[PDB]
Amino acid sequence: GKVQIVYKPVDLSKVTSKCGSLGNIHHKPGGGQVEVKSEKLDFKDRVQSKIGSLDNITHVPGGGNKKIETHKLTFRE
Amino acid sequence: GKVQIVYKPVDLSKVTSKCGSLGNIHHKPGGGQVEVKSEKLDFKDRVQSKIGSLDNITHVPGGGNKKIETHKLTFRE
Amino acid sequence: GKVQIVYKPVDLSKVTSKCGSLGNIHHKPGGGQVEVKSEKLDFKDRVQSKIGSLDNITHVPGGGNKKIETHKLTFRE
Lengths: 77, 77, 77
Known about the structure:
The structure is a homotrimer.
Chain A: E1 3-7, E2 10-11, E3 14-19, E4 24-27, E5 33-37, E6 40-43, E7 48-58, E8 66-74
């Protein structure tokens, strides 16, 4: 006999923003100091690392809106 | 008998922004200092690394909007 | 008997921005200082690394919008 499986979700969603103006932004942090002392670094299978990092970031996207959706039909997993 | 499997999701999403003007942005951090010391670095299988990094970033996209969507029909994994 | 597997997702999405004007942006960080000292480096199988980097980046795309989509119909993995 018939097996009928229908996966048909409808998506009419909206993610939105309306901004009149995005101002005066001043990213002026005082000068940072980073000091890392080590004797030996020994890395093997799939290790990932950041050592002694000083990052200054000003992002300010004006939208910066995001949508994430995952649709899945699965029989064994 | 029939096996009928139909994967037909319908997507009419919007991800949007309206920004009237994108400002006056001043990324002026004080000068950072990074010091890193080692005797030995020893890296093997599939290591990835960053050592002693000083990064200044001003992004400011005007949109910067994003959609991430995944669609899986799968029988075994 | 009939096995009928149909994969027909419909995408009518939009990822959009409207920005009236993209300002005056001043990326003027103070002069950075990076100092990395090591005696010996030893890298093997599939290693990737960055040592002693000073990066100043001003991006300002005016759109910078992105859509990532992935579609799978799959039977073993």
